[PDB]
Scaffold this active site. Structure first.
Site, PDB file in Angstrom:
ATOM      1  CG  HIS A 163      23.955   6.364  -9.068  1.00  0.00           C
ATOM      2  ND1 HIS A 163      23.134   6.126 -10.472  1.00  0.00           N
ATOM      3  CD2 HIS A 163      23.285   8.109  -8.551  1.00  0.00           C
ATOM      4  CE1 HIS A 163      22.003   7.127 -10.364  1.00  0.00           C
ATOM      5  NE2 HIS A 163      22.399   7.973  -9.404  1.00  0.00           N
ATOM      6  CD  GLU A 164      24.591   9.277  -5.391  1.00  0.00           C
ATOM      7  OE1 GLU A 164      24.337  10.724  -5.867  1.00  0.00           O
ATOM      8  OE2 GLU A 164      23.651   8.522  -4.997  1.00  0.00           O
ATOM      9  CG  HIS A 176      23.972  12.262  -9.528  1.00  0.00           C
ATOM     10  ND1 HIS A 176      23.177  13.324 -11.208  1.00  0.00           N
ATOM     11  CD2 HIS A 176      23.604  11.375  -9.522  1.00  0.00           C
ATOM     12  CE1 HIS A 176      22.023  12.110 -10.827  1.00  0.00           C
ATOM     13  NE2 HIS A 176      22.423  10.972  -9.784  1.00  0.00           N
ATOM     14  CE1 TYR A 216      18.939  13.871 -10.860  1.00  0.00           C
ATOM     15  CE2 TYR A 216      17.190  14.012  -9.801  1.00  0.00           C
ATOM     16  CZ  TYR A 216      18.262  13.387 -10.073  1.00  0.00           C
ATOM     17  OH  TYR A 216      18.084  11.558  -9.204  1.00  0.00           O
ATOM     18  CD  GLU A 234      19.343   9.310 -11.138  1.00  0.00           C
ATOM     19  OE1 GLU A 234      19.103   7.369 -10.984  1.00  0.00           O
ATOM     20  OE2 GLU A 234      19.780  10.227 -10.848  1.00  0.00           O
ATOM     21  CG  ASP A 279      12.067   9.489 -10.034  1.00  0.00           C
ATOM     22  OD1 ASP A 279      13.024  10.042  -9.507  1.00  0.00           O
ATOM     23  OD2 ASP A 279      12.003   8.535 -10.469  1.00  0.00           O
ATOM     24  CG  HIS A 334      15.159   7.945  -9.645  1.00  0.00           C
ATOM     25  ND1 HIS A 334      15.283   9.127  -9.263  1.00  0.00           N
ATOM     26  CD2 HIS A 334      16.662   7.745  -9.167  1.00  0.00           C
ATOM     27  CE1 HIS A 334      15.646   9.667  -8.667  1.00  0.00           C
ATOM     28  NE2 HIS A 334      17.670   9.268  -8.465  1.00  0.00           N
TER      29      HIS A 334
END
Ligand SMILES: CC(C)C[C@H](NC(=O)[C@@H](NP(=O)(O)CNC(=O)OCc1ccccc1)C(C)C)C(=O)O
Ligand SMILES: [Ca+2]
Ligand SMILES: [Ca+2]
Ligand SMILES: [Ca+2]
Ligand SMILES: [Ca+2]
Ligand SMILES: [Zn+2]
EC number: 3.4.24.27
Length: 316
Positions: A142-143, A146, A157, A166, A226, A231
């Site tokens: 996931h990271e 990004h 974002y 996301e 958020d 998310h």
């Protein structure tokens, strides 16, 4: 660091033993020279200055409890590298084998992980909500994903483009988990979330409502938390993605599944050739339809399933 490539052994966060690519120069460093221009893992030593110190070990054995998060960050970064190269013909996050860097033991009790614009960052968790987050292969992919997004579509974002950003990271985090094929699922972070509670996770792609995320556009969050719910609203695209791959009937709309591999190809193509920093959900549907069309022809089942899926989550 300049040195000779070696192989160390240790234990990850979940107690699993694995080989890791290190570099030897007085100490054994967590530096993998076998992939692109290297994979580098750093010790932030419970502080927040980054990246910290290149991980140094005297004997190339990483079985200490303090070593576990570094082992998994380093190894799962390599698994994620392999996915992008072998599956999408992409060399590292920038496409030109940029060095991949990760820091672990970030801050104290830190219940999160992130990409800071230049490297991956993993907290250890507070031991109750989380264990060290790099123990989750979906979290690591996931990271890294990004980074891929930032170098490609550049999805801003916040609000809908941020939920897409996301979802993209959850989708490829999941595709990478299946690629490593150790207990894969359509859940996010289950390996490192709430050590005392079995069967839960951060998010579910197959039923986002299970953890309070929308699974239909009419249920989208439009408040300010958020970053406009990036998310939260990612559940709408996650669901669409799960449906495209696995099929199903959602709010009465039936979707013919086409499999993970085709899902990854279509979304990979959307991400690198059609999405832009400001794309919204409706623009993501068109990107995905155009991508499936490119790969499988306008009359294929693939395009048809992509259409069914976005219909099913109410995205026109
Ligand atoms: C950690 C979870 C409880 C929730 C959640 N985090 C996540 O779902 C994932 N972390 P993430 O990468 O999306 C956090 N991103 C994030 O915090 O982005 C903010 C940022 C930081 C540095 C530079 C620019 C922008 C990961 C844990 C699978 C969140 O940040 O809300
Ligand atoms: Ca050692
Ligand atoms: Ca799993
Ligand atoms: Ca998972
Ligand atoms: Ca749990
Ligand atoms: Zn994220």
């Amino acid at each position: 660091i300049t040195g000779t490539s070696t192989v160390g052994v240790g234990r990850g966060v979940l107690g699993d033993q694995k080989n890791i690519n290190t570099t030897y120069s007085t100490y054994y460093y967590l530096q993998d020279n076998t992939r692109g221009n290297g994979i580098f893992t750093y010790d932030a030593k419970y502080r927040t200055t980054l990246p910290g110190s290149l991980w140094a070990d005297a004997d190339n054995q990483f079985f200490a409890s303090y070593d576990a998060p570094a082992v998994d960050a380093h190894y799962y970064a390599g698994v994620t590298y392999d996915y992008y190269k072998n599956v999408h013909n992409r060399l590292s996050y920038d496409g030109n084998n940029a060095a991949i860097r990760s820091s672990v033991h970030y801050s104290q009790g830190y219940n999160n992980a992130f990409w800071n614009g230049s490297q991956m960052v993993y907290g250890d968790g507070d031991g109750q909500t989380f264990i060290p987050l790099s123990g989750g292969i979906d979290v690591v992919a996931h990271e890294l994903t990004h980074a891929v997004t930032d170098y490609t579509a550049g999805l801003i974002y916040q609000n809908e483009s941020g939920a897409i950003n996301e979802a993209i990271s959850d989708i490829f985090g999941t595709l990478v988990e299946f690629y490593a094929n150790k207990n894969p699922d359509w859940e996010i972070g289950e390996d490192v979330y709430t050590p005392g509670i079995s069967g839960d996770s951060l998010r579910s792609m197959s039923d986002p409502a299970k953890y309070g995320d929308p699974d239909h556009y009419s249920k989208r969050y439009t408040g300010t938390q958020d970053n406009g719910g990036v998310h939260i609203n990612s559940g709408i695209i996650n669901k669409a993605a799960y449906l495209i791959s696995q099929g199903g009937t959602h709010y009465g709309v039936s979707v013919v599944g086409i499999g993970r591999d085709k899902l990854g190809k279509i979304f990979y193509r959307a991400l690198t050739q059609y999405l832009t920093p400001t794309s919204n959900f409706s623009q993501l549907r068109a990107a995905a339809v155009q991508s499936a069309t490119d790969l499988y022809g306008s009359t294929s089942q693939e395009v048809a399933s992509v259409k069914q899926a976005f219909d099913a989550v109410g995205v026109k």
